[PDB]
């Protein structure tokens, strides 16, 4: 007989996933949050959308789901579907495509002592207002804002996860070995901050969220090779018109106006790439 | 709400209502389903894909005698809003879709009246096949159609018909797409000329085939050619007529063939412009292409 | 339809829709497969995919759904939601976009003898290898391979639908003819397994010639 | 938390979401409706579709979902799946090609007094008549007509939460400036059915386009071409370059017609001002 | 979820009583609620003052209509009452309440409404008096087979005063009468204990009167 | 201008007894009436709405009736937590409200004769130029009692104040103090001072007097 | 859907589905042996080197693993050293020179 079945029956025969794991209504559930970025898929300037692939590590305590390994033959972990346990319902608030939740509903790991871990992966399309002023030599500041869709700050709060050395991971985690840099974008910084607001008496119950600020840098090699250098040379050609003879066969106006025509072609080329 | 909670219990629990069965005393009988179509807005007609995108509200009316009640026995209640999954439905779908969306978009509540009449007005966004006649483009008009039938039920089981309206106690069928004159905003490129509705029956097909009956709502739509006129035709026609000026240029100017070949290049740019705006059909050469 | 309800409750007592109908172990379920082409939507050469709108035509006998019409008020046929009965897992194996199944389940028609006919609609994007050598004066050979995903030939035996043509059925009045393509041939073949785990296929072929007027005019 | 479990078991023992959440069938459900505009995603002038990100706050009392907090350990509010209770079926009447009704069934906050607050998100794609007369200096007026699809004003009554939409959490738009926004309630009674008024709330937005993009990319090149067109008449004829210059200006405008058509709204409701200027420049070269 | 009153507990005569009510975890812009004020006094019982809708519509008690102004503040989710020309008759416990409106449809008549108060605050006592802070005067009420004795606490303002006996040692039979407003505008009461007669000449009785606004502490020994 | 009148103004009762409270409207109000319960030092709690419908969570023993000018609030079996003040509330189509005077319900006990005491003013008070004379009625039920003063066997009125405690938790009786205030000159002018108690449990009026 | 399955996930998924979503039937043998061969569209992130384009060679990978089960509770092994290309359709743009599962 698999002791996992007995443990599951013991933990879930009388269990309410709709209720928060708090002994009293006014107690708060603390959530430990980490966000690991696997790939920066793209940044669409026309749509002003950042597509990223991540997975979110979310740890908390559920006293109802507490057990000891001695009472169950040495089981230290139990995988169960995430729909059977209470979840804090973390969503990306600043999504653009209407997709708030995670991509794959993975199992939760219930450890002895009542510790619950959930590590679902996600693909997120988020709003990133593109600062166009120095395009293509530009850097962007794209936000990833995570919050509970249901509970206020007095009901569910956030803390950052710690590594094995005990230091707080207040940033986007990236596995260096598995990371492949985006072809056009380099991630320079990624600080995370836990914000609290609406805490005033008139503002009602307090609210909180976690904002990660991906400071990313464009690699402008494509625009330099394909647009800027040819355009600079063709636009320098008009200076040659000053050295041609001012006679019938000089073809001075030929050079100048045809450089203008080439620049018009470059305008058509550039219109397909710039932000709108 | 004791009253229609009691009524819903009486209709669906006490009387054992079964949504899988049709509302007919005997199997050989058929259910009369009256259909009307309201056009909320014509979204688009993509020529290259030959797809008509529309927003339409489908008014279904039929009779379900199992859902009758005495109003005074239930607190004078005359109408009930129920989910469509609680009741039998005349599963009407758009046969001539070209994207797989056969069914309505939003499954709203049915309205059930105390005399057994079930009224249901689901809205839908439909993408249908509209083959394009390019012969007179951009002075063309198109003939699109929305064909509604039931794949679950055949003519043996349901009888499609048009909605009947009344005026001065005279009944007439609604043989057209309904458009609210106040609430309708015309499409920016297509003006509706005709909008008939027809119950099409195939005498060749057998009764127990889904292709026996359908209701088709047609749209005859004329293109408003102002954009194409202003942006292509006047520049294109003027640049094409430009080539006649070489005959008035003296041969000593040395700029005749340059002018003419430049006109040809401009025409080629215009052809590049038009290449992306129409499908590569072989029925006819477009007028602008001609 | 009280008689119909009683017949339905009689038929679907102890009925498992996930169990293949085999009265004895080793009995094969014969499935006749046919295709009706409602529209040849397109043949994208960039994506190398043929988009078609079709109706399948699947016929098989389910002995559990047989009854005597004389004992059920002369009811000789029923129309039942397809998810309520066992279905063969016939799918388009060579689909391009990852969509294997039909667009709408609709209903099966069950006769008193246990015969079940199912004609579900399907919008299919099938992979077609484009022969680019003579483009745009080219003809293409785009196949649709239909077969059970799970069951092997020892469980489900496929055959071409007829009653006898081995061809795609195109209704003459109601076919949406493509403006760029002309259908030259439209056969159907039953491919036996090579040489259990072996499986038959029903392949519906479309040999289509492009009509090159656009390229003549514009290029 | 066991108090909440017992409470939820008690409330939904014989609850019906089909049935309206009142105590008499002659009662009318009051829904307070408020619109929060999170983002103006895009204005499509060709198809005349405005796509926006919104939160649709709805507040109403459920009279079968009351309890005494003292009987349940002082629990005063709980969170319930919205699919488990009756909801008003608010529909965007002027939806262009999006979802008609709410499809994100987030949880509702239920108070012990019976008050329910439900604030689902939505992406509203609403048909908006686009006046292109002054493009790119045009001003639009885009409404969002919301109403109970299957309930008339005699059974469900809707009122606005505020005179204006909530723009506190509105993200800055790089293309439009919302000068004005306002919500109005309308009631319409027909002569055929004088006892079933039909209610709606229309939230209209007045938005001014930011024209710098089109000024830089469209207007200035045509201005240059137009300016350069007069100076062929200062060229001598004996140089043999007048036709070269003018024809090259014409070819530049012909190439620029690619930029024009890909950028200009391809609609025939009227001639855009930028299109008028393009035609002027072409005719005069 | 909860309503909370706020405002001064003492208003001089002819001044305006200003009170505010704040909502906890709830908005004032709801179409099925009116927000009202109800004062309770021992001589007039429960009495509704005024009610207001979130659109500004207001209704008033006819007796108090002239002196009453009810207002909202939707930004802070509050609603306030102002009672002008306040006099001693307006000393009362003011509650802020949610007047819950139900609507009904009548054929050919439209909407008709029903009301009940389903939410109340805690109730803020407001006293209208021109008196200034003053400490009490303690007088022994000395005894004349059971005897009585007490302490008379006179001419103090405002409430409360705590009276204990023998530093709280004596509690049985102790009865502290409620304060009574005299015509002079100051409060008075008595605190009495009954004991056996035989203990009158043998037992010591001390009443400890504490008044917090004046910080007055009196320990009056009651004896014959 | 509808006026509501409750009856009785005070209803003694005991646990297990059936209790009735009447309210009456000047005009006909149909069933536009609610009933509230208020504990001491607490906000009122709604019990009945529409004159016959019970609010959620309220015990089922409470019932309401009346479809006209006269309404009833009935307690089938009085529980010890039902001792509270009950109000009838009248509303209209608009949010205009009136309330009844209220009906107090006390635990009923046995009739007790008051213990009567008289206390003169103290010397310290007499030094201040005022004379307060108290007299006390201790441990008496019910609340109906009359108190008078006599000065040299001459009745007084209009200058005595009456302060009363609530029901005691244990024996459920009342205590009352009647205080007369006078100036020192008036106090010194008249010799004999007495108070006179009339109570239903007393066979005859009971007088306590003193001389100076 | 009725039975327990391994939760295999494509770790380098770019914008497709992380896990199997087409829940096809499992073949169950009387010995308890289960074979499950679902289809999938894998969209995998892969470092693309464009130095020699169009004469470029690309080495792309697909990392698969049980997301929530470690090696102590669920062990995965390759069926074969190489991916099965017996039913591989010819590509008109790419030639697979090498393939190997580790
Ligand atoms: C952008 O486009 C929208 C349309 O989509 C315009 O919206 C209209 O705005 C005007 C205000 O400028 C609205 O007019 C007002 O309607 C109010 C509500 O009317 C409804 O409810 C009443 C009952 O309360 C019914 O009688 C009526 O039939 C409706 O059902 C009225 O209460 C207002 O009255 C006030 O103004 C009038 C002016 O004539 C005075 O006579 C009155 O005394 C009172 O002061 C007013 O009539 C109009 O209803 C809106 N229509 C909509 C939303 O469809 C925007 O104005 C437009 N913006 C710009 C900048 O052009
Ligand atoms: C004097 C100057 C030189 C003159 C110039 C005349 C220019 C064309 C004018 C319009 C012709 C229309 C026409 O009937 O074309 C036909 C031949 O179409 C061809 O075959 C022409 C294209 C040939 C391309 C080169 C082929 C080389 C081999 C094809 O017609 P359609 O496409 O079947 O239908 C067209 C539309 N309609 C149905 C209204 C007729
Ligand atoms: C990338 O974007 C992020 C998010 O936008 C940004 O972080 C934010 O920066 C702003 C400042 O630009 C922060 O706002 C501050 O908040 C603190 C309280 O935490 C306030 O004290 C600050 O007050 C200043 O500004 C006020 C308004 O001008 C003044 O009135 C006042 O006197 C002060 O001058 C200010 O409001 C915000 O908190 C952060 N949010 C985070 C970190 O989550 C980040 O800086 C950007 N990175 C770049 C550009 O590299
Ligand atoms: C969990 O239960 C175990 C016994 O099964 C007990 O030893 C332990 O103390 C409990 N832990 C907590 C945090 O309650
Ligand atoms: C209340 O009940 C008593 C006893 O039945 C009855 O005498 C009295 O009339 C009732 N009052 C009303 C208003 O019905």
Six-digit token pair at F33?
A: 């009436």
Question: B124 with B187: CB under 8 angstroms?
Answer: no
- Residue A99 CA to residue B114 CA, distance in Å, equals 43
Specify the 3-state DSSP secondary structure of C50: strand
Residue reference for tokens 């007393």? F202
Q: Which helix (H) or strand (E) holds C63?
A: strand C49-66
Question: G41 with G15: CB under 8 angstroms?
Answer: no
Look up residue D219 and give its DSSP letter: I
**Closest ligand to the CA of A65:** 4
Question: E5 with E96: CB under 8 angstroms?
Answer: yes
Six-digit token pair at A16?
A: 């309410």
Residue D32, min C-alpha distance to chain E (Å) = 6
Would strands F19-25 and B51-63 be described as parallel, antiparallel, or unpaired? Answer: unpaired
Q: What backbone phi and psi angles, to 5 degrees, belong to F179?
A: -115, 125
Q: E59-72: b or e for each residue (b if 16 or more CB lie within 10 Å)?
A: bbbeebeebbbbeb
Helix D273-284 and helix D220-229: axis angle, to 10°?
20
Specify the 3-state DSSP secondary structure of A12: helix
Quick check: CB of C214 below 6 Å from ligand 2?
no
User: What residues form DSSP beta bridges with D274?
Assistant: none
Measure the N-to-C terminal CA separation of chain A; round to a whole number of Å.
64
Helix A252-271 and helix D220-229: axis angle, to 10°?
160
Cβ-in-10-Å burial (0-12, 13-18, 19+) of A238 comes to middle
Q: A70 CA to middle of ligand 4, Å?
A: 10
Q: B284 CA to middle of ligand 2, Å?
A: 9
Count CB-CB contacts under 10 A for residue E90. Answer: 20
Six-digit token pair at E133?
A: 């802070």
Six-digit token pair at F90?
A: 């009248």
Q: What backbone phi and psi angles, to 5 degrees, belong to C41?
A: -65, -50
Angle at F100 between CA F98 and CA F101, to 5 degrees: 130
Distance of CA G99 to the CA centre of its chain: 12
Q: What is the CA radius of gyration of chain A?
A: 28
Q: What does D27-38 look like in DSSP terms, one character per residue?
A: EEEEEEEEEEEE
Specify the 3-state DSSP secondary structure of E125: strand
Residue reference for tokens 């027909």? D190
Cis bond before residue A240 (omega within 30° of 0): no
3-state secondary structure chain B: CHHHHHHHHHHHHHCCCCCCCCCCCCCCCCEEEEEEEEEEEEEEEECCCCEEEEEEEEEEEEECHHHCCCCHHHCCCCEEEECHHHCCCCCCEECCECCCCCCCCCCCCEEEECCCEEEECCEEEEEEECCCCCCCCCCCEEEEEEEEECCCCCCCCEEEEECEEEECCEEEECCECECCCCCCCCCCCEEEEECEEEEEECCCCCCCCCCCEEEEEEEEEEECCHHHHHHHHHHHHHHHHHHHHHHHCCHHHCCHHHHHHHHHHHHHHHHHHHHCCCCCCCCCCCCCCC
> Which residues of chain D are within 8 Å of residue B83 when distances are taken between CB atoms?
18
Q: F10-21: b or e for each residue (b if 16 or more CB lie within 10 Å)?
A: ebbbeeeeebeb
Mutate to test the interface with D, among B81, B105, B224, B238 (most CBs of D within 10 A): B81
Calculate the CA dihedral of residues B63, B69, B72, B73 and round it to 10 degrees. Answer: 180
- Residue A97 CA to residue A103 CA, distance in Å, equals 13
User: Across the interface, do F163 and E177 touch by the CB < 8 Å criterion?
Assistant: yes
> CA nearest G34: which of C24, C150, C25?
C150
- Residue D159 CA to residue E111 CA, distance in Å, equals 14
Six-digit token pair at B149?
A: 């039938």
- Residue G57 CA to residue G52 CA, distance in Å, equals 8
User: What residues form DSSP beta bridges with F130?
Assistant: F183
Residue reference for tokens 């972990």? A77
Question: A81 with A105: CB under 8 angstroms?
Answer: yes
Count CB-CB contacts under 10 A for residue E127. Answer: 17
> CA nearest B2: which of C83, D63, F13, E102?
D63
Give whole-number Cα distances, C217 to B275, B285, C144, C212, in Å.
11, 8, 33, 9
Give whole-number Cα distances, G32 to A43, C154, G3, G26, G78, in Å.
48, 20, 12, 11, 20
Q: What does E102-115 look like in DSSP terms, one character per residue?
A: EEEEETTTEEEEEE
Q: D66 at the F interface (CB within 8 A)?
A: yes
- Experimentally, the structure was elucidated by cryo-EM
- Residue A107 CA to residue G9 CA, distance in Å, equals 12
Six-digit token pair at C158?
A: 């496929």
> CA nearest E213: which of E138, E150, E160?
E160
Helix D220-229 and helix D242-263: axis angle, to 10°?
160
Which residues, other chains included, contact C181 with Cβ-Cβ below 8 Å and sequence gap of 6+? C40, C43, C208, C209, C210, C211
Neighbours of chain D (3+ CB pairs under 8 A): A, B, E, F
Resolution in A: 2.2
Give whole-number Cα distances, C120 to C21, C163, E17, in Å.
20, 19, 77
Count CB-CB contacts under 10 A for residue C42. Answer: 19
Chain E interface residues (partner D, CB cutoff 8 A): 1-2, 25-27, 29-32, 74, 100-108, 111, 118-119
Count CB-CB contacts under 10 A for residue A125. Answer: 21
Six-digit token pair at A152?
A: 């206020």
Which residues, other chains included, contact D216 with Cβ-Cβ below 8 Å and sequence gap of 6+? none
Q: What does A128-195 look like in DSSP terms, one character per residue?
A: -----TTTTS-EEEEEEEEEESS--TTTEEEEE-B-TT--B--B-B--TTT----SSEEEEE-BEEEE
Rounded (to 5) percent helix, strand, coil in chain A: 20, 35, 40
User: What residues form DSSP beta bridges with E181?
Assistant: E187
Q: Which of C81, C121, C179 lies at the smallest CB-CB distance from B282?
A: C179
Count CB-CB contacts under 10 A for residue F149. Answer: 18
- Residue B5 CA to residue D21 CA, distance in Å, equals 11
Helices (H) and strands (E) in chain G, counts: 0, 4
Contact between chain G and chain D (3 or more Cβ pairs less than 8 Å apart): no
Residue F7 region by backbone torsions, left for phi larger than 0, else alpha for psi between -120 and 50, else beta: beta
Q: D32 at the B interface (CB within 8 A)?
A: no
Give whole-number Cα distances, G48 to A186, B219, D233, G102, in Å.
15, 50, 56, 21
User: Across the interface, do D47 and B108 touch by the CB < 8 Å criterion?
Assistant: no
Question: D86 with D18: CB under 8 angstroms?
Answer: yes
C-to-N gaps above 2.5 Å in chain G, after residues: none
Give whole-number Cα distances, F187 to C191, E161, E205, F181, F212, in Å.
130, 28, 28, 9, 10
Which residues, other chains included, contact D42 with Cβ-Cβ below 8 Å and sequence gap of 6+? D50, D51
Which residues, other chains included, contact B12 with Cβ-Cβ below 8 Å and sequence gap of 6+? B86
> CA nearest E151: which of A81, F134, D77, B115?
F134
Six-digit token pair at D158?
A: 């809707």
Quick check: CB of F70 below 6 Å from ligand 5?
yes
- Residue B148 CA to residue B59 CA, distance in Å, equals 12
- Residue C26 CA to residue D274 CA, distance in Å, equals 76
Give whole-number Cα distances, A89 to A17, C93, F187, in Å.
12, 38, 81
Specify the 3-state DSSP secondary structure of D88: coil
Residue reference for tokens 């047989």? C66
Q: What does D115-140 look like in DSSP terms, one character per residue?
A: EEEE--EEEEEEE-----TTTTS-EE
- Residue A134 CA to residue A218 CA, distance in Å, equals 11
- Residue B139 CA to residue D234 CA, distance in Å, equals 42
Residue reference for tokens 């608009």? F94
Q: Which atom of ligand 5 is nearest to F24's Cα?
A: 13
Cβ-in-10-Å burial (0-12, 13-18, 19+) of C202 comes to buried
Q: D240-249: b or e for each residue (b if 16 or more CB lie within 10 Å)?
A: bbbbbbbbbb
Mutate to test the pocket of ligand 5, among F22, F51, F100, F103 (most ligand atoms within 8 A of CB): F22
Six-digit token pair at C177?
A: 């003819």
Q: Which helix (H) or strand (E) holds C2?
A: helix C2-11
Question: A36 with A55: CB under 8 angstroms?
Answer: yes
Six-digit token pair at F93?
A: 């189509």
Which residues, other chains included, contact E194 with Cβ-Cβ below 8 Å and sequence gap of 6+? E146, E147, E148, E149, E173, F115, F138
Q: What does chain F look like in DSSP terms, one character per residue?
A: ---EEEE-SEEEE-TT--EEEEEEESS--TT-EEEEEE-TTS--EEEEETTTEEPTTS-TTEEEE-SSSEEEEEESS--GGG-SEEEEEE--SSS--EE---EEEEE----BPPEEEEE---HHHHHTTEEEEEEEEEEEBSS-EEEEEEETTEEE-SSEEEEE----TTT--EEEEEEEEEEHHHHHH---EEEEEEETT-SS-EEEEE--
């Amino acid at each position: 007989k698999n002791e996992e079945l007995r443990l599951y029956h013991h933990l879930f025969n009388n269990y309410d996933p709709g209720s928060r794991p708090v002994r009293e209504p006014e107690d708060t559930v603390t959530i430990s949050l980490k966000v690991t970025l696997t790939n920066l898929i793209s940044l669409n300037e026309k749509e002003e959308t950042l597509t990223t692939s991540v997975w979110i590590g979310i740890d908390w305590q559920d006293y109802r789901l507490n057990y000891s390994k001695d009472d169950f033959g040495g089981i230290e972990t139990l995988r169960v579907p995430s729909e059977l346990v209470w979840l804090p319902e973390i969503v990306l608030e600043n999504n653009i495509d209407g997709q708030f939740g995670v991509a794959y509903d993975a199992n939760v790991l219930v450890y002895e002592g009542g510790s619950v871990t959930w590590l679902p992966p996600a693909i997120y399309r988020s709003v990133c207002a593109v600062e166009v002023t120095y395009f293509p030599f530009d850097w962007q500041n794209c936000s990833l804002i995570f919050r509970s869709q249901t509970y206020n700050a007095e009901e569910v709060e956030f803390t950052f996860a710690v590594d094995n050395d005990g230091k707080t991971i207040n940033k986007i985690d990236i596995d260096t070995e598995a990371y492949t840099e985006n072809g056009e974008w380099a991630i320079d910084f990624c600080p995370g901050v836990i914000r609290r607001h609406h805490g005033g008496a008139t503002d009602g119950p307090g609210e909180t969220d976690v904002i990660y600020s991906l400071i990313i840098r464009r690699k402008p090699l494509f625009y330099v090779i394909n647009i800027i250098v040819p355009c600079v040379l063709i636009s320098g050609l008009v200076l040659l018109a000053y050295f041609l003879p001012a006679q019938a066969g000089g073809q001075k106006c030929t050079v100048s106006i045809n450089v203008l025509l080439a620049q018009t072609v470059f305008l058509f080329l550039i219109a397909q790439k710039i932000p709108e | 709400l004791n009253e229609e909670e009691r009524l819903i219990r009486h209709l669906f629990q006490e009387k054992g209502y079964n949504k899988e069965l049709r509302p007919v005393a005997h199997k050989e009988e058929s259910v009369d389903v009256a259909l009307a179509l309201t056009l909320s807005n014509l979204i688009s007609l993509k020529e290259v894909e030959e797809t008509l995108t529309t927003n339409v509200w489908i008014e279904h009316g039929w009779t379900d005698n199992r859902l009758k009640w005495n109003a005074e026995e239930f607190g004078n209640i005359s109408v009930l809003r129920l989910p469509p999954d609680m009741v039998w439905l005349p599963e009407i779908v758009l046969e001539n879709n070209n994207d797989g969306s056969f069914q309505i978009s939003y499954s709203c509540n049915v309205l059930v009246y105390h005399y057994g009449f079930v009224y249901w007005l689901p809205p839908a966004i439909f993408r249908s096949s509209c083959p394009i006649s390019v012969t007179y483009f951009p002075f063309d008009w198109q003939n699109c159609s929305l064909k509604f039938s039931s794949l679950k039920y055949t003519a043996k089981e349901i009888t499609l018909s048009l909605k009947q309206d009344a005026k001065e106690n005279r009944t007439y069928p609604v043989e057209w797409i309904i458009i609210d004159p106040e609430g309708f905003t015309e499409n920016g490129e297509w003006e509706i000329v005709h909008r008939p509705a027809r119950v099409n029956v195939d005498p060749r097909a057998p009764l127990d085939s889904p292709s026996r009956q359908d209701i088709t709502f047609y749209l005859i739509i004329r293109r408003k050619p102002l954009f194409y006129i202003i942006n292509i035709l006047v520049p294109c026609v003027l640049i094409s007529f430009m080539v006649n000026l070489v005959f008035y240029l003296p041969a000593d100017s040395g700029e005749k063939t340059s002018v003419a070949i430049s006109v040809l290049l401009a025409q080629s740019v215009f052809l590049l412009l038009i290449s992306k705006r129409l499908p590569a059909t072989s029925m006819a050469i477009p007028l602008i292409g001609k | 339809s009280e008689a119909e309800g009683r017949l339905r409750e009689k038929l679907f007592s102890g009925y498992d829709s996930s169990v293949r109908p085999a009265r004895e172990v080793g009995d094969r379920v014969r499935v006749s497969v046919g295709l009706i082409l409602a529209q040849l939507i397109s043949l994208n050469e960039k994506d190398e995919e043929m988009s078609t709108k079709v109706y399948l035509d699947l016929e098989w006998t389910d002995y559990r759904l047989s009854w005597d019409p004389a004992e059920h008020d002369g009811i000789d046929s029923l129309r039942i939601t397809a998810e309520s009965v066992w279905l063969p897992d016939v799918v388009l194996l060579n689909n391009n976009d990852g969509n294997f199944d039909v667009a709408l389940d609709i209903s099966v028609v069950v006769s008193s003898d246990g015969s079940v006919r199912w004609q579900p609609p399907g919008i299919y994007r099938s992979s077609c290898s484009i022969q680019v050598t003579y483009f745009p004066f080219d003809w293409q050979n785009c196949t649709m391979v239909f077969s059970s995903y799970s069951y092997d030939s020892s469980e489900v035996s496929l055959q071409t639908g007829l009653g006898g043509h081995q061809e795609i059925h195109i209704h003459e009045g109601t076919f949406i003819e493509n403006g760029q393509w002309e259908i030259i041939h439209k056969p159907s073949r039953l491919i036996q397994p090579p040489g259990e785990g072996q499986r038959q296929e029903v392949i519906f072929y479309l040999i289509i010639r492009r009509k090159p007027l656009f390229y003549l005019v514009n290029v | 938390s066991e108090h909440e479990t017992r409470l939820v078991a008690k409330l939904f023992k014989d609850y019906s979401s089909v049935v309206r959440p009142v105590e008499d069938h002659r009662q009318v459900v009051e829904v307070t409706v408020g619109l929060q505009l999170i983002q103006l995603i895009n204005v499509d002038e060709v198809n005349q579709i405005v796509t926006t990100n919104v939160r649709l706050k709805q507040q109403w009392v459920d009279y079968n979902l009351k309890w005494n907090p003292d009987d349940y350990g002082g629990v005063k509010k709980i969170h319930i799946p919205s699919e488990k209770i009756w909801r008003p079926d608010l529909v965007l009447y002027n939806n262009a090609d999006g979802d008609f009704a709410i499809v994100k069934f987030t949880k509702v906050l239920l108070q012990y007094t019976g008050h329910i607050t439900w604030t689902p998100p939505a992406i509203f794609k609403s048909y908006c008549e686009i006046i292109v007369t002054h493009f790119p200096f045009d001003e639009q007026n885009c409404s969002m007509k919301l109403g109970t699809w299957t309930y008339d004003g005699s059974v469900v009554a809707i009122n606005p939460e505020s005179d204006q939409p909530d723009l506190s959490n509105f993200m800055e738009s790089g293309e439009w400036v919302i000068k004005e926004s306002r919500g109005w309630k309308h009631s319409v009674t027909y002569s055929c059915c004088p006892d079933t008024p039909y209610l709606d709330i229309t939230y209209h937005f007045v938005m001014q386009r930011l024209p710098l993009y089109f000024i830089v990319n469209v207007i200035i090149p045509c201005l240059l071409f137009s300016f350069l067109t007069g100076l062929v008449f200062y060229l001598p004829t004996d140089s043999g370059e007048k036709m070269t210059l003018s024809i090259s200006v014409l070819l530049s405008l012909t190439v620029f017609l690619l930029v024009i058509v890909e950028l200009i709204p391809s609609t025939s409701s009227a001639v855009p001002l930028i299109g008028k200027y393009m035609l002027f420049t072409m005719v005069f070269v | 979820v909860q309503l909370q009153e706020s405002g001064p507990g003492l208003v001089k005569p002819s001044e305006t009583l200003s009170l505010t009510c704040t909502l906890s975890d709830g908005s004032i812009s709801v179409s099925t609620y009116y927000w009202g004020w109800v004062r309770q006094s021992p001589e007039k019982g429960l009495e509704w003052i005024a009610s207001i809708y979130y659109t500004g519509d207001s209704y008033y008690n006819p007796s108090l209509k002239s002196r009453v102004t009810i207002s909202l503040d939707k930004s802070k989710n509050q609603f306030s009452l102002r009672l002008r020309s306040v006099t001693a008759a307006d000393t009362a416990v003011y509650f802020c309440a949610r007047d819950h409106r139900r609507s009904f449809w009548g054929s050919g008549s439209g909407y008709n409404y029903r009301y009940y108060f389903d939410m109340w605050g805690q109730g803020t006592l407001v006293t209208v008096s021109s008196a200034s802070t003053k400490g009490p005067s303690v007088f022994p009420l000395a005894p004349s087979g059971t005897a009585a004795l007490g302490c008379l606490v006179k001419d103090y303002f405002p409430e409360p005063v705590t009276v204990s006996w023998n530093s709280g040692a004596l509690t049985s039979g102790v009865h502290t009468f409620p304060a009574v407003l005299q015509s002079s505008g100051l409060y008075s009461l008595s605190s009495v204990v009954t004991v056996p007669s035989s203990s009158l000449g043998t037992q010591t009785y001390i009443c400890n009167v504490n008044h917090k606004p004046s910080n007055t502490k009196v320990d009056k020994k009651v004896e014959p | 201008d509808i006026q509501m009148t409750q009856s009785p103004s005070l209803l003694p009762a005991s646990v297990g007894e059936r209790v009735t409270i009447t309210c009456q409207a000047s005009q006909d109000i149909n069933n536009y009436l609610n009933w509230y319960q208020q504990k001491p030092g607490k906000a009122p709690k709604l019990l009945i709405y529409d004159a016959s419908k019970l609010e959620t969570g309220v015990p089922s023993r409470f019932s309401g009736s009346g479809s006209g000018t006269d309404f009833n609030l009935t307690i089938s079996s009085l529980q010890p937590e039902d001792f509270a003040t009950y109000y009838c509330h009248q509303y209209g189509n608009l949010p205009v409200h009136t309330f009844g005077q209220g009906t107090k319900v006390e635990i009923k006990r046995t009739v007790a004769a008051p213990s009567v005491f008289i206390f003169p003013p103290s010397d310290e008070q007499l030094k201040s130029g005022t004379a307060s004379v108290v007299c006390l009625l201790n441990n008496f039920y019910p609340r109906e009692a009359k108190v008078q003063w006599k000065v040299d066997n001459a009745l007084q009125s209009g200058n005595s104040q009456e302060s009363v405690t609530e029901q005691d938790s244990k024996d459920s009786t009342y205590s009352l103090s009647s205080t007369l205030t006078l100036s020192k000159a008036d106090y010194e002018k008249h010799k004999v001072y007495a108070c006179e108690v009339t109570h239903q449990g007393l066979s005859s009026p009971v007088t306590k007097s003193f001389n100076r």
